[PDB]
Short mmCIF file of C-alpha atoms and ligand atoms in Angstrom, two decimals:
data_model
loop_
_atom_site.label_atom_id
_atom_site.label_comp_id
_atom_site.label_asym_id
_atom_site.label_seq_id
_atom_site.Cartn_x
_atom_site.Cartn_y
_atom_site.Cartn_z
CA UNK T 1 -22.45 11.49 1.34
CA UNK T 2 -19.56 13.23 -0.38
CA UNK T 3 -19.54 16.60 -2.16
CA UNK T 4 -16.78 18.54 -3.83
CA UNK T 5 -17.78 22.07 -4.68
CA UNK T 6 -15.67 24.07 -7.10
CA UNK T 7 -12.52 22.35 -5.82
CA UNK T 8 -9.10 23.32 -7.05
CA UNK T 9 -5.68 22.10 -5.87
CA UNK T 10 -2.66 23.96 -7.09
CA UNK T 11 1.07 23.56 -6.61
CA UNK T 12 3.68 26.22 -7.11
CA UNK T 13 7.04 25.27 -8.58
CA UNK T 14 9.40 28.17 -9.34
CA UNK T 15 7.20 30.61 -11.23
CA UNK T 16 5.14 27.70 -12.67
CA UNK T 17 1.61 27.09 -11.38
CA UNK T 18 0.31 23.54 -11.55
CA UNK T 19 -3.39 22.69 -11.34
CA UNK T 20 -3.66 19.12 -10.00
CA UNK T 21 -7.43 19.69 -9.82
CA UNK T 22 -9.16 22.49 -11.52
CA UNK T 23 -12.70 23.68 -10.43
CA UNK T 24 -13.95 20.15 -9.92
CA UNK T 25 -17.52 19.36 -8.89
CA UNK T 26 -18.51 15.98 -7.63
CA UNK T 27 -21.49 14.53 -5.84
CA UNK T 28 -21.37 11.00 -4.46
CA UNK T 29 -24.55 9.86 -2.62
CA UNK T 30 -24.76 7.64 0.45
CA UNK T 31 -24.34 3.97 -0.57
CA UNK T 32 -23.14 4.71 -4.09
CA UNK T 33 -20.28 2.73 -5.65
CA UNK T 34 -18.27 5.00 -7.87
CA UNK T 35 -15.07 4.33 -9.84
CA UNK T 36 -12.62 7.00 -10.91
CA UNK T 37 -10.41 6.62 -14.01
CA UNK T 38 -8.11 8.75 -16.11
CA UNK T 39 -4.45 9.02 -17.39
CA UNK T 40 -1.57 8.81 -15.02
CA UNK T 41 -1.24 12.38 -13.61
CA UNK T 42 -4.82 13.42 -14.24
CA UNK T 43 -5.52 14.16 -10.57
CA UNK T 44 -7.18 10.96 -9.34
CA UNK T 45 -5.12 10.58 -6.14
CA UNK T 46 -5.37 14.31 -5.43
CA UNK T 47 -9.11 13.90 -5.62
CA UNK T 48 -9.25 10.84 -3.37
CA UNK T 49 -6.89 12.51 -0.86
CA UNK T 50 -9.15 15.54 -0.71
CA UNK T 51 -12.19 13.36 -0.14
CA UNK T 52 -10.22 11.40 2.40
CA UNK T 53 -9.33 14.66 4.31
CA UNK T 54 -5.61 13.88 3.85
CA UNK T 55 -5.13 17.06 1.84
CA UNK T 56 -7.01 20.32 1.70
CA UNK T 57 -8.14 22.01 -1.48
CA UNK T 58 -6.55 25.28 -2.51
CA UNK T 59 -9.98 26.67 -3.38
CA UNK T 60 -13.46 25.14 -2.86
CA UNK T 61 -15.54 23.28 -0.27
CA UNK T 62 -15.64 19.64 0.82
CA UNK T 63 -18.50 17.94 2.59
CA UNK T 64 -18.23 14.53 4.20
CA UNK T 65 -21.35 12.86 5.61
CA UNK T 66 -22.98 16.29 5.71
CA UNK T 67 -19.96 17.87 7.50
CA UNK T 68 -18.04 20.74 5.97
CA UNK T 69 -14.37 19.81 6.43
CA UNK T 70 -12.53 22.82 5.02
CA UNK T 71 -12.19 24.96 8.13
CA UNK T 72 -11.67 22.12 10.60
CA UNK T 73 -8.60 21.95 12.83
CA UNK T 74 -6.39 18.85 12.63
CA UNK T 75 -7.97 17.35 15.81
CA UNK T 76 -11.43 17.49 14.29
CA UNK T 77 -10.08 16.27 10.88
CA UNK T 78 -8.29 13.40 12.51
CA UNK T 79 -11.58 12.45 14.19
CA UNK T 80 -13.61 12.68 10.98
CA UNK T 81 -11.10 10.54 9.04
CA UNK T 82 -11.05 7.90 11.76
CA UNK T 83 -14.87 7.90 12.19
CA UNK T 84 -15.98 8.22 8.61
CA UNK T 85 -13.27 6.97 6.25
CA UNK T 86 -11.43 3.73 5.49
CA UNK T 87 -8.57 4.60 3.16
CA UNK T 88 -6.55 2.18 1.00
CA UNK T 89 -3.30 3.82 0.03
CA UNK T 90 -1.80 3.27 -3.42
CA UNK T 91 1.49 2.25 -1.88
CA UNK T 92 0.03 0.80 1.36
CA UNK T 93 1.77 3.04 3.92
CA UNK T 94 2.10 0.26 6.49
CA UNK T 95 4.08 0.72 9.74
CA UNK T 96 7.36 -1.13 9.15
CA UNK T 97 7.94 -2.19 12.73
CA UNK T 98 4.42 -3.48 13.40
CA UNK T 99 3.17 -6.89 12.18
CA UNK T 100 0.36 -7.19 9.68
CA UNK T 101 -2.13 -7.85 12.52
CA UNK T 102 -0.75 -4.95 14.61
CA UNK T 103 -1.07 -2.62 11.60
CA UNK T 104 -4.72 -3.55 11.31
CA UNK T 105 -5.29 -3.24 15.08
CA UNK T 106 -3.82 0.25 15.16
CA UNK T 107 -6.97 2.10 13.95
CA UNK T 108 -9.07 0.14 16.47
CA UNK T 109 -7.01 1.58 19.31
CA UNK T 110 -7.79 5.19 18.32
CA UNK T 111 -11.42 4.81 17.12
CA UNK T 112 -12.19 7.47 19.75
CA UNK T 113 -15.79 6.14 19.99
CA UNK T 114 -15.92 3.08 22.21
CA UNK T 115 -13.19 0.94 23.77
CA UNK T 116 -12.50 -2.62 22.67
CA UNK T 117 -10.69 -5.15 24.92
CA UNK T 118 -7.51 -6.63 23.50
CA UNK T 119 -9.22 -9.87 22.64
CA UNK T 120 -12.07 -8.02 20.84
CA UNK T 121 -9.57 -5.94 18.96
CA UNK T 122 -7.49 -8.90 17.81
CA UNK T 123 -10.64 -10.77 16.78
CA UNK T 124 -11.86 -7.79 14.67
CA UNK T 125 -8.40 -7.30 13.07
CA UNK T 126 -8.30 -11.03 12.11
CA UNK T 127 -11.80 -10.79 10.61
CA UNK T 128 -10.60 -7.93 8.44
CA UNK T 129 -7.50 -9.85 7.26
CA UNK T 130 -9.81 -12.71 6.27
CA UNK T 131 -12.16 -10.31 4.43
CA UNK T 132 -9.08 -8.93 2.63
CA UNK T 133 -8.17 -12.48 1.56
CA UNK T 134 -4.90 -12.65 3.54
CA UNK T 135 -4.08 -16.05 4.99
CA UNK T 136 -3.96 -16.09 8.76
CA UNK T 137 -0.37 -17.46 8.61
CA UNK T 138 0.80 -14.09 7.38
CA UNK T 139 -0.76 -12.23 10.32
CA UNK T 140 2.52 -12.15 12.18
CA UNK T 141 4.77 -11.14 9.26
CA UNK T 142 6.02 -7.59 9.26
CA UNK T 143 5.58 -5.56 6.00
CA UNK T 144 9.13 -6.20 4.84
CA UNK T 145 8.41 -9.92 5.08
CA UNK T 146 5.37 -9.77 2.79
CA UNK T 147 4.97 -9.60 -0.98
CA UNK T 148 3.57 -6.45 -2.52
CA UNK T 149 0.13 -8.00 -2.94
CA UNK T 150 0.16 -9.33 0.61
CA UNK T 151 0.99 -5.85 1.82
CA UNK T 152 -1.91 -4.55 -0.35
CA UNK T 153 -4.36 -6.85 1.48
CA UNK T 154 -3.01 -5.63 4.87
CA UNK T 155 -3.73 -2.09 3.69
CA UNK T 156 -7.24 -3.11 2.62
CA UNK T 157 -7.85 -4.93 5.97
CA UNK T 158 -6.76 -1.82 7.89
CA UNK T 159 -9.16 0.38 5.95
CA UNK T 160 -12.03 -1.84 6.99
CA UNK T 161 -11.00 -2.14 10.67
CA UNK T 162 -13.12 0.62 12.16
CA UNK T 163 -16.09 -0.34 9.94
CA UNK T 164 -16.32 3.14 8.41
CA UNK T 165 -19.29 4.23 6.24
CA UNK T 166 -16.97 5.42 3.49
CA UNK T 167 -14.27 3.31 1.74
CA UNK T 168 -11.81 5.17 -0.40
CA UNK T 169 -9.47 2.77 -2.41
CA UNK T 170 -6.57 3.91 -4.45
CA UNK T 171 -5.92 1.19 -7.01
CA UNK T 172 -6.71 -1.53 -4.45
CA UNK T 173 -6.05 -4.52 -6.87
CA UNK T 174 -2.87 -3.34 -8.58
CA UNK T 175 -0.55 -5.80 -6.84
CA UNK T 176 -3.01 -8.67 -7.09
CA UNK T 177 -3.41 -11.43 -9.62
CA UNK T 178 -6.77 -11.46 -11.44
CA UNK T 179 -8.43 -14.08 -9.19
CA UNK T 180 -7.46 -12.51 -5.91
CA UNK T 181 -8.32 -9.02 -7.18
CA UNK T 182 -11.75 -10.32 -8.15
CA UNK T 183 -12.32 -11.51 -4.56
CA UNK T 184 -11.48 -8.03 -3.31
CA UNK T 185 -13.93 -6.48 -5.75
CA UNK T 186 -16.65 -8.94 -4.73
CA UNK T 187 -15.97 -7.84 -1.15
CA UNK T 188 -16.42 -4.15 -1.99
CA UNK T 189 -19.63 -5.02 -3.85
CA UNK T 190 -20.89 -6.92 -0.75
CA UNK T 191 -19.97 -4.07 1.67
CA UNK T 192 -21.66 -1.63 -0.73
CA UNK T 193 -24.87 -3.50 -1.32
CA UNK T 194 -25.38 -5.45 1.93
CA UNK T 195 -23.88 -2.94 4.34
CA UNK T 196 -24.67 0.28 2.51
CA UNK T 197 -21.11 1.53 2.47
CA UNK T 198 -20.17 4.37 0.13
CA UNK T 199 -17.31 3.16 -2.07
CA UNK T 200 -14.99 5.18 -4.25
CA UNK T 201 -12.31 3.32 -6.27
CA UNK T 202 -9.52 4.81 -8.31
CA UNK T 203 -8.32 2.35 -10.92
CA UNK T 204 -6.65 1.74 -14.22
CA UNK T 205 -8.36 -1.59 -14.73
CA UNK T 206 -11.64 -1.18 -16.67
CA UNK T 207 -12.72 -4.51 -15.26
CA UNK T 208 -12.30 -3.18 -11.78
CA UNK T 209 -14.14 0.08 -12.61
CA UNK T 210 -17.11 -1.88 -13.92
CA UNK T 211 -18.08 -2.84 -10.35
CA UNK T 212 -19.15 0.79 -9.90
CA UNK T 213 -22.57 2.22 -10.61
CA UNK T 214 -20.75 4.83 -12.73
CA UNK T 215 -17.24 5.80 -13.83
CA UNK T 216 -15.89 9.35 -13.50
CA UNK T 217 -13.13 10.13 -15.91
CA UNK T 218 -10.50 12.84 -15.16
CA UNK T 219 -8.26 14.53 -17.65
CA UNK T 220 -5.67 17.21 -16.90
CA UNK T 221 -7.20 17.96 -13.48
CA UNK T 222 -10.81 18.18 -14.62
CA UNK T 223 -13.83 15.85 -14.77
CA UNK T 224 -13.85 14.91 -18.50
CA UNK T 225 -16.98 12.76 -18.47
CA UNK T 226 -19.11 10.19 -16.58
CA UNK T 227 -20.32 6.86 -17.78
CA UNK T 228 -23.39 5.37 -16.10
CA UNK T 229 -23.14 1.61 -15.85
CA UNK T 230 -26.49 0.39 -14.39
CA UNK B 1 22.53 -15.17 -20.54
CA UNK B 2 20.73 -16.00 -17.31
CA UNK B 3 20.79 -19.44 -15.66
CA UNK B 4 19.28 -20.59 -12.46
CA UNK B 5 20.26 -24.17 -11.57
CA UNK B 6 18.48 -25.92 -8.69
CA UNK B 7 17.90 -22.55 -7.07
CA UNK B 8 16.23 -22.46 -3.65
CA UNK B 9 15.45 -19.44 -1.50
CA UNK B 10 14.19 -19.94 2.09
CA UNK B 11 13.25 -17.70 5.04
CA UNK B 12 13.09 -18.80 8.68
CA UNK B 13 9.86 -17.59 10.35
CA UNK B 14 9.96 -18.98 13.88
CA UNK B 15 10.62 -22.72 13.81
CA UNK B 16 9.16 -22.82 10.31
CA UNK B 17 11.23 -22.67 7.14
CA UNK B 18 9.50 -20.99 4.16
CA UNK B 19 10.34 -21.68 0.58
CA UNK B 20 10.13 -18.49 -1.55
CA UNK B 21 11.61 -20.50 -4.39
CA UNK B 22 12.19 -24.28 -4.43
CA UNK B 23 14.56 -26.17 -6.70
CA UNK B 24 13.85 -23.98 -9.72
CA UNK B 25 15.63 -24.39 -13.01
CA UNK B 26 15.62 -21.60 -15.59
CA UNK B 27 17.61 -20.74 -18.65
CA UNK B 28 17.09 -17.38 -20.36
CA UNK B 29 18.94 -16.97 -23.65
CA UNK B 30 20.71 -13.70 -24.61
CA UNK B 31 18.19 -11.41 -26.28
CA UNK B 32 15.15 -13.39 -25.17
CA UNK B 33 12.01 -11.62 -24.01
CA UNK B 34 10.50 -13.62 -21.13
CA UNK B 35 7.45 -12.96 -18.96
CA UNK B 36 6.80 -14.29 -15.44
CA UNK B 37 3.34 -14.59 -14.00
CA UNK B 38 1.78 -16.20 -10.96
CA UNK B 39 -0.33 -15.65 -7.77
CA UNK B 40 0.57 -12.94 -5.26
CA UNK B 41 3.39 -14.39 -3.18
CA UNK B 42 4.38 -17.22 -5.61
CA UNK B 43 8.00 -16.19 -5.76
CA UNK B 44 8.22 -13.81 -8.79
CA UNK B 45 10.00 -10.94 -7.06
CA UNK B 46 12.36 -13.41 -5.42
CA UNK B 47 13.16 -14.90 -8.79
CA UNK B 48 13.72 -11.46 -10.39
CA UNK B 49 15.81 -10.32 -7.38
CA UNK B 50 18.10 -13.34 -7.72
CA UNK B 51 18.44 -12.90 -11.44
CA UNK B 52 19.20 -9.27 -10.79
CA UNK B 53 21.94 -10.02 -8.33
CA UNK B 54 20.06 -8.18 -5.52
CA UNK B 55 19.68 -11.39 -3.48
CA UNK B 56 21.49 -14.80 -3.33
CA UNK B 57 19.89 -18.20 -3.43
CA UNK B 58 19.90 -20.28 -0.23
CA UNK B 59 21.08 -23.14 -2.43
CA UNK B 60 21.84 -23.57 -6.14
CA UNK B 61 23.78 -21.70 -8.78
CA UNK B 62 23.18 -18.49 -10.69
CA UNK B 63 24.96 -17.48 -13.88
CA UNK B 64 24.80 -14.09 -15.51
CA UNK B 65 26.40 -13.56 -18.92
CA UNK B 66 28.46 -16.68 -18.12
CA UNK B 67 29.67 -15.32 -14.76
CA UNK B 68 28.80 -17.36 -11.70
CA UNK B 69 27.31 -14.88 -9.23
CA UNK B 70 25.96 -16.98 -6.32
CA UNK B 71 29.30 -17.07 -4.49
CA UNK B 72 30.28 -13.41 -5.09
CA UNK B 73 30.47 -10.79 -2.35
CA UNK B 74 28.16 -7.78 -1.95
CA UNK B 75 30.84 -5.56 -3.51
CA UNK B 76 31.45 -7.93 -6.46
CA UNK B 77 27.73 -8.43 -7.19
CA UNK B 78 27.26 -4.66 -7.25
CA UNK B 79 29.84 -4.29 -9.93
CA UNK B 80 28.04 -6.87 -12.08
CA UNK B 81 24.67 -5.23 -11.39
CA UNK B 82 25.87 -1.80 -12.31
CA UNK B 83 27.29 -3.13 -15.62
CA UNK B 84 24.76 -5.74 -16.76
CA UNK B 85 21.34 -5.03 -15.24
CA UNK B 86 18.67 -2.34 -15.40
CA UNK B 87 16.08 -3.13 -12.68
CA UNK B 88 12.55 -1.68 -12.45
CA UNK B 89 11.46 -2.15 -8.82
CA UNK B 90 7.80 -3.02 -8.02
CA UNK B 91 7.61 -0.04 -5.67
CA UNK B 92 10.16 2.09 -7.60
CA UNK B 93 12.66 2.64 -4.81
CA UNK B 94 13.48 6.22 -5.91
CA UNK B 95 15.68 8.58 -3.82
CA UNK B 96 13.38 11.13 -2.10
CA UNK B 97 15.53 14.23 -2.03
CA UNK B 98 16.68 13.95 -5.67
CA UNK B 99 14.71 15.22 -8.65
CA UNK B 100 13.37 12.79 -11.24
CA UNK B 101 16.28 13.71 -13.48
CA UNK B 102 18.77 13.29 -10.71
CA UNK B 103 17.41 9.87 -9.80
CA UNK B 104 18.02 8.81 -13.38
CA UNK B 105 21.56 10.18 -13.48
CA UNK B 106 22.70 8.05 -10.53
CA UNK B 107 23.08 4.61 -12.28
CA UNK B 108 24.37 6.41 -15.41
CA UNK B 109 27.26 7.89 -13.40
CA UNK B 110 27.87 4.83 -11.15
CA UNK B 111 28.47 2.71 -14.24
CA UNK B 112 30.18 5.25 -16.44
CA UNK B 113 33.88 4.81 -15.83
CA UNK B 114 34.98 8.25 -16.95
CA UNK B 115 34.16 11.85 -15.95
CA UNK B 116 30.89 12.91 -17.48
CA UNK B 117 30.08 16.59 -18.07
CA UNK B 118 27.23 18.15 -16.10
CA UNK B 119 25.63 19.06 -19.41
CA UNK B 120 25.84 15.57 -20.83
CA UNK B 121 24.62 14.04 -17.53
CA UNK B 122 21.41 16.00 -18.11
CA UNK B 123 21.34 15.10 -21.78
CA UNK B 124 21.40 11.29 -21.38
CA UNK B 125 19.06 11.36 -18.39
CA UNK B 126 16.48 13.40 -20.31
CA UNK B 127 16.61 11.02 -23.20
CA UNK B 128 15.95 8.15 -20.75
CA UNK B 129 12.92 10.03 -19.35
CA UNK B 130 11.59 10.57 -22.85
CA UNK B 131 11.93 6.90 -23.70
CA UNK B 132 10.00 6.18 -20.45
CA UNK B 133 7.19 8.45 -21.75
CA UNK B 134 7.49 11.02 -18.98
CA UNK B 135 7.06 14.67 -19.99
CA UNK B 136 10.11 16.91 -19.73
CA UNK B 137 8.19 19.28 -17.54
CA UNK B 138 8.41 16.65 -14.73
CA UNK B 139 12.19 16.22 -14.74
CA UNK B 140 12.72 18.66 -11.88
CA UNK B 141 10.00 17.20 -9.72
CA UNK B 142 11.02 15.12 -6.72
CA UNK B 143 9.37 11.69 -6.24
CA UNK B 144 6.92 13.07 -3.62
CA UNK B 145 5.85 15.69 -6.20
CA UNK B 146 4.91 13.03 -8.76
CA UNK B 147 1.92 10.72 -9.17
CA UNK B 148 2.47 6.98 -8.80
CA UNK B 149 2.60 6.38 -12.52
CA UNK B 150 5.00 9.24 -13.06
CA UNK B 151 7.21 7.77 -10.38
CA UNK B 152 6.98 4.40 -12.22
CA UNK B 153 8.25 6.08 -15.39
CA UNK B 154 11.17 7.53 -13.47
CA UNK B 155 11.95 3.99 -12.21
CA UNK B 156 11.75 2.73 -15.82
CA UNK B 157 14.04 5.55 -17.05
CA UNK B 158 16.52 4.75 -14.30
CA UNK B 159 16.68 1.16 -15.43
CA UNK B 160 17.52 2.39 -18.95
CA UNK B 161 20.24 4.80 -17.79
CA UNK B 162 23.16 2.29 -17.65
CA UNK B 163 22.30 0.97 -21.12
CA UNK B 164 22.27 -2.53 -19.68
CA UNK B 165 22.24 -5.72 -21.78
CA UNK B 166 19.56 -7.09 -19.37
CA UNK B 167 16.36 -5.28 -18.34
CA UNK B 168 14.49 -6.79 -15.40
CA UNK B 169 11.05 -5.27 -14.71
CA UNK B 170 8.78 -6.00 -11.75
CA UNK B 171 5.22 -5.11 -12.80
CA UNK B 172 6.42 -2.13 -14.85
CA UNK B 173 2.94 -0.98 -15.93
CA UNK B 174 0.92 -1.33 -12.75
CA UNK B 175 0.63 2.44 -12.12
CA UNK B 176 0.00 3.32 -15.74
CA UNK B 177 -3.19 3.75 -17.81
CA UNK B 178 -3.55 1.26 -20.69
CA UNK B 179 -2.23 3.63 -23.38
CA UNK B 180 0.87 4.82 -21.54
CA UNK B 181 1.52 1.18 -20.51
CA UNK B 182 1.28 0.08 -24.11
CA UNK B 183 3.97 2.52 -25.01
CA UNK B 184 6.28 1.19 -22.35
CA UNK B 185 5.84 -2.34 -23.59
CA UNK B 186 6.40 -1.19 -27.19
CA UNK B 187 9.66 0.38 -25.95
CA UNK B 188 10.69 -2.90 -24.39
CA UNK B 189 9.89 -4.75 -27.62
CA UNK B 190 12.09 -2.32 -29.53
CA UNK B 191 15.00 -2.58 -27.14
CA UNK B 192 14.69 -6.33 -27.28
CA UNK B 193 14.39 -6.71 -31.01
CA UNK B 194 16.45 -3.83 -32.32
CA UNK B 195 19.19 -3.71 -29.70
CA UNK B 196 19.24 -7.33 -28.62
CA UNK B 197 18.54 -6.59 -25.00
CA UNK B 198 17.45 -9.51 -22.76
CA UNK B 199 14.15 -8.58 -21.15
CA UNK B 200 12.38 -10.26 -18.23
CA UNK B 201 9.07 -8.87 -17.03
CA UNK B 202 7.00 -9.89 -14.03
CA UNK B 203 3.31 -9.06 -14.56
CA UNK B 204 -0.29 -9.77 -13.53
CA UNK B 205 -1.46 -8.33 -16.91
CA UNK B 206 -1.78 -11.05 -19.56
CA UNK B 207 -1.62 -8.38 -22.32
CA UNK B 208 1.76 -7.33 -20.96
CA UNK B 209 2.96 -10.92 -20.67
CA UNK B 210 2.10 -11.46 -24.32
CA UNK B 211 4.92 -9.18 -25.43
CA UNK B 212 7.29 -11.96 -24.35
CA UNK B 213 8.23 -15.00 -26.54
CA UNK B 214 7.72 -17.19 -23.43
CA UNK B 215 5.70 -16.97 -20.25
CA UNK B 216 6.86 -18.76 -17.10
CA UNK B 217 4.17 -19.47 -14.49
CA UNK B 218 5.07 -19.78 -10.84
CA UNK B 219 3.11 -21.35 -8.04
CA UNK B 220 4.12 -21.96 -4.45
CA UNK B 221 7.70 -21.08 -5.24
CA UNK B 222 8.07 -23.58 -8.10
CA UNK B 223 7.74 -23.36 -11.91
CA UNK B 224 4.16 -24.59 -12.52
CA UNK B 225 4.40 -24.40 -16.30
CA UNK B 226 5.83 -22.70 -19.34
CA UNK B 227 3.97 -21.20 -22.38
CA UNK B 228 5.86 -20.74 -25.61
CA UNK B 229 4.36 -17.90 -27.59
CA UNK B 230 6.50 -18.52 -30.69
CA UNK B 231 7.10 -21.65 -32.74
CA UNK B 232 9.70 -24.31 -31.93
N1 ADP Z 301 3.56 18.14 -4.35
C1 ADP Z 301 3.36 18.40 -5.71
N2 ADP Z 301 3.97 19.41 -6.28
C2 ADP Z 301 3.79 19.70 -7.58
N3 ADP Z 301 2.99 18.86 -8.38
C3 ADP Z 301 2.38 17.84 -7.84
C4 ADP Z 301 2.52 17.55 -6.48
N4 ADP Z 301 1.80 16.39 -6.17
C5 ADP Z 301 1.24 16.01 -7.26
N5 ADP Z 301 1.56 16.89 -8.32
C6 ADP Z 301 1.12 16.74 -9.66
O1 ADP Z 301 -0.33 16.77 -9.71
C7 ADP Z 301 -0.75 15.86 -10.70
C8 ADP Z 301 -1.81 14.84 -10.25
O2 ADP Z 301 -1.37 13.73 -9.50
P1 ADP Z 301 -2.39 12.64 -9.00
O3 ADP Z 301 -1.22 12.04 -8.10
O4 ADP Z 301 -3.10 13.82 -8.42
O5 ADP Z 301 -2.47 12.13 -10.46
P2 ADP Z 301 -3.08 10.74 -10.71
O6 ADP Z 301 -3.49 10.10 -9.43
O7 ADP Z 301 -4.28 10.77 -11.67
O8 ADP Z 301 -2.04 9.80 -11.36
C9 ADP Z 301 0.49 15.20 -11.29
O9 ADP Z 301 0.86 15.69 -12.57
C10 ADP Z 301 1.51 15.53 -10.36
O10 ADP Z 301 2.78 15.68 -10.97
N1 ADP Z 302 12.09 -11.31 4.14
C1 ADP Z 302 11.15 -12.34 4.16
N2 ADP Z 302 10.95 -13.08 5.24
C2 ADP Z 302 10.08 -14.08 5.24
N3 ADP Z 302 9.30 -14.35 4.16
C3 ADP Z 302 9.49 -13.65 2.99
C4 ADP Z 302 10.40 -12.60 2.99
N4 ADP Z 302 10.39 -12.05 1.72
C5 ADP Z 302 9.48 -12.72 1.05
N5 ADP Z 302 8.91 -13.71 1.79
C6 ADP Z 302 7.89 -14.58 1.35
O1 ADP Z 302 8.29 -15.30 0.19
C7 ADP Z 302 7.16 -15.45 -0.66
C8 ADP Z 302 7.44 -14.91 -2.06
O2 ADP Z 302 7.75 -13.54 -2.08
P1 ADP Z 302 7.75 -12.82 -3.46
O3 ADP Z 302 8.99 -13.18 -4.29
O4 ADP Z 302 7.79 -11.31 -3.10
O5 ADP Z 302 6.37 -13.27 -4.17
P2 ADP Z 302 5.74 -12.56 -5.46
O6 ADP Z 302 6.69 -11.59 -6.10
O7 ADP Z 302 5.30 -13.65 -6.43
O8 ADP Z 302 4.50 -11.81 -4.90
C9 ADP Z 302 5.97 -14.79 0.00
O9 ADP Z 302 5.15 -15.71 0.63
C10 ADP Z 302 6.62 -13.91 0.98
O10 ADP Z 302 5.76 -13.64 2.03
O1 PI Z 303 3.97 -9.59 -5.55
P1 PI Z 303 2.60 -9.59 -5.81
O2 PI Z 303 1.91 -9.89 -4.49
O3 PI Z 303 2.23 -10.68 -6.85
O4 PI Z 303 2.19 -8.24 -6.27
O1 PI Z 304 -0.04 7.62 -12.26
P1 PI Z 304 -1.16 7.08 -11.47
O2 PI Z 304 -1.35 7.92 -10.25
O3 PI Z 304 -0.94 5.63 -10.95
O4 PI Z 304 -2.43 7.02 -12.40
NA1 NA Z 305 -3.19 7.35 -8.30
NA1 NA Z 306 6.32 -8.91 -6.02
#
C-alpha cells in the first residue's frame, strides 16, 4: 500500500548539507498498522510528510496505493492526497476562521469524487467529531476557542472525513490525557481491523506504538531497526 | 510566591456562560515544584496563563511575589511577566522569521535593563539552548526548519533566558522522546533545588508530574484533588 524506495531528503544550509532522511527503504502493506518511533529530529515527520505527499524526496521513489507519486503535478498530487490519505498534523493546522465542524466539512467539499448535499456533509462531519471523541457542544467553537487536545481531536476528525484508505497520524495523542488518548487508539485499531485501513502512527509514547503490528525506529535519518509485535 | 484566591475565568459562547476555572484557590510557595494534571479541557492552560500574567481572572485575586496582579493593566502585567516569569507555551509560540538563537535572545534583551553586547547576547542565548538540550548546530535554524521537539527545546530555552524566579511550563516534554524529556525534567529539578526557582508544570505524563512535590488535579474547571509527594 505504501513503498519508499531509496528515499533521501536533504536540506542545504550555507555550505552545510543536512540529511533528514538518508537512503530509506520502507514497505507498508495494505491494512497494516505500523508505528514509527525515534529521537526528536530523527526524521519521523519528514518520512510521514513524504508518505503523505506533502513533501517530495530529494532522491528516490514513492508509491501510494500502487501509484508512483514522484513525477506527478500538483493537481494530480492534490487529488491523490484527498482520495487516498487522511493526515493528522502534529500541530493540527486548523483554519482559524472556520469552526471545528466547518474545518471537518472542508475536505468533504473537495473530495472530487461524488457530491454530498449540505445535510449529508454536516452529518458526516459530526460523525467524525464523535469518532474523534469531541463533544458535540464544541462543534461550533473556532480553533482559538478550543484547548490543545480539543483541537487535536478536530484534526483527527478532519483526517477521517473523506474515509480515506490510508491514515497518517503524527503524534495523534500528544495533547490528550491517557484515557482520551486510549479511546483514539482504540478507534484506529477498529478502523484498521474492521475497515481494513492502512494506519501509520508517529509517536513518542511506547504505549501508543504498541497498537501497531510493528514499530519502525529511526535514528539520524535512517531506519535503525524494526520490532515485530504480533 | 503565587496565590489564586477565589479565581474564576468564564467565556460567553452564545447565551451560555462557560467556566474555564471556577472558584479555585491555590497557594504555591516560593521554590516549590508543583505539577498540574487533568483531562483535556479541564482548565490547566487557563490556570497557568493566569499565574503567568498572560490572562486575568473574570473574578478573584491573583498575587505574584506578593504583588497583586489581577487589577494591573496590560503594560503593567508585561513588566511583571518580563521580570518574574519564564513561560513554556504548549504550542511554543516562536517567532517565525527569527533563528532559534534569536528567538531566545528576545526575552533576555527585553528584561535586561542595560545595553548588552552582540557577542554576549549570543553567549547567554547559546547557554540557554544547551541547558534545553538542543545541539548548537541548530541555533541558526528558523522554527520552520526545526522538528517539533527541537522547537519545544527552543521554547524551553526562551523561558530560561530572563533567569526568572518562576518557570511555568505547559506540557514541556510532549514533543520529546523519553530520554530527552528526562533531561529536561532533570534540568527543572536542578533549577528548583539548586537555584530556588518556583516551578509549575502542566502535564499528561505521570512520570513528569512526579518530579513535583505536589500534584494538583483539575476537573471541569475546579480543583478535584491534591496529591502530596513529600511528607507533611
Ligand atoms: N526546512 C529544513 N531545513 C533544514 N533542516 C530541516 C528542515 N526541516 C527539517 N529539518 C531537519 O530535519 C530533521 C528531521 O526532522 P523531522 O521533523 O524530520 O524529525 P522528527 O520528526 O523525527 O522529530 C531535523 O533535525 C530538522 O532539524
Ligand atoms: N477563548 C475561549 N472561548 C471560549 N472557550 C474557551 C476559550 N478558551 C478556552 N476555552 C475553554 O475553556 C476550557 C479550558 O481551557 P484550557 O485551559 O485550555 O483547558 P486545558 O488546558 O486543561 O486543556 C475548555 O473547555 C476550552 O474550550
Ligand atoms: O489542553 P489539553 O487539551 O489537555 O492538551
Ligand atoms: O521532535 P519530534 O519531531 O516531536 O520528535
Ligand atoms: Na514529529
Ligand atoms: Na492546554
